[PDB]
Amino acid sequence: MATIKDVAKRANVSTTTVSHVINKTRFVAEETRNAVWAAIKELHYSPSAVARSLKV
């Protein structure tokens, strides 16, 4: 599915890894960082918006 759930697994393991990157707290290696951003786009992650993500 195009959710953070699937993305987290494809990226590394759990949503924790994704949170670390986005929140920019536990600075992971560029490998994990890139994997997260890549997975997010690859799975076409839909933040409660199948259309897209812009405006308000």
Swiss-Prot record:
Changing residue 54 to M: Slight decrease in operator DNA affinity. Residues 4-23, 48-56 bind DNA. Is the main repressor of the genes involved in the de novo synthesis of purine nucleotides, regulating purB, purC, purEK, purF, purHD, purL, purMN and guaBA expression. In addition, it participates in the regulation or coregulation of genes involved in de novo pyrimidine nucleotide biosynthesis, salvage and uptake (pyrC, pyrD, carAB and codBA), and of several genes encoding enzymes necessary for nucleotide and polyamine biosynthesis (prsA, glyA, gcvTHP, speA, glnB). Binds to a 16-bp palindromic sequence located within the promoter region of pur regulon genes. Homodimer. The corepressors hypoxanthine and guanine bind cooperatively to single PurR sites in each subunit of the dimer, inducing a conformational change which increases the affinity of PurR for its DNA operator sites. This is HTH-type transcriptional repressor PurR. Induction: Negatively autoregulated. Residues 2-56 form the HTH lacI-type domain. Changing residue 55 to A: Decrease in operator DNA affinity. Consists of two structural and functional domains: an N-terminal DNA-binding domain, approximately the first 60 residues, and a larger C-terminal domain, approximately 280 residues, which imparts the function of corepressor binding and oligomerization. It comes from Escherichia coli (strain K12).
